[PDB]
Structures are given as structure tokens and as C-alpha cells.
Design a binder for this molecule. Sequence first.
Ligand SMILES: *C(=O)/C=C\c1ccc(O)cc1
Length: 125
Amino acid sequence: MEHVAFGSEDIENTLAKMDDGQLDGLAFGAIQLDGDGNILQYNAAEGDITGRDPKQVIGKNFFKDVAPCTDSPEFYGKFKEGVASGNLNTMFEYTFDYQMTPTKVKVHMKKALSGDSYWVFVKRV
Ligand SMILES: *C(=O)/C=C\c1ccc(O)cc1
């Protein structure tokens, strides 16, 4: 495993060194999005939670195509505000229920170290 704890204060620094293969060693789901919500990275733990095949969701838009549960002011709304402000660091619980058994998760969204990229971290609660 890669020893990084969910919710760690310097998580963006740690994950900046990881390739897709290293991301797959995290104890929690991790998705990297561009400013438009397009999926840049999607790790194995997330695929384990949602059932989606990581290779197949990369390049798709998270909010429009992949995870319409999140297209709401409570999730998407927060993301868009963060993108516009250039700053984002928020944690909340949510339920994923599209084409799957309803699953309650903890979500942490944080801006990445790189300019126009954003992390969504996910773990079961
Ligand atoms: C609602 O959010 C439904 C599905 C979904 C699929 C993949 C990921 O990663 C999150 C959510």
C-alpha cells in the first residue's frame, strides 16, 4: 500500500509524486478532475466502491456522464465555486445511487498542487 491517510493536511503534496499505478495503492478512492470536471485519473479503490472500470471512465465528464448523482448544488455546485475561486477544500458525506446499490460515502475535494486540477477523495462510512 501507499501510506497516506484520508483527510491528511498535505495530501496534495504527497499525491503529486504518484503515477496511476501508485494511486491504485491508496486505501481510499481518488479521482483527479480538470476544471471542466473531466476525469484525468481514477483509482482502483474508487472502482471498488462504484463498480466503474477506471480505464473506461477516464476522459469522460464526471458530472454529466459518469456520476449524475453529483450534479447538484451540494456537490457540483461546490466544485464549480472552487474552480472559479482557485481554492477548494471541503469534506462532506454523500450517497452514490446511479446504476448501483445506494452507497454512503465521505467525500473530500481539494485543489491539486498543479494549476487546473482537482482531487475528489472517497471512502466508505
Ligand atoms: C452517482 O454519483 C453515481 C455514480 C458514480 C460513479 C462513479 C463514481 O466514481 C462516483 C459516482
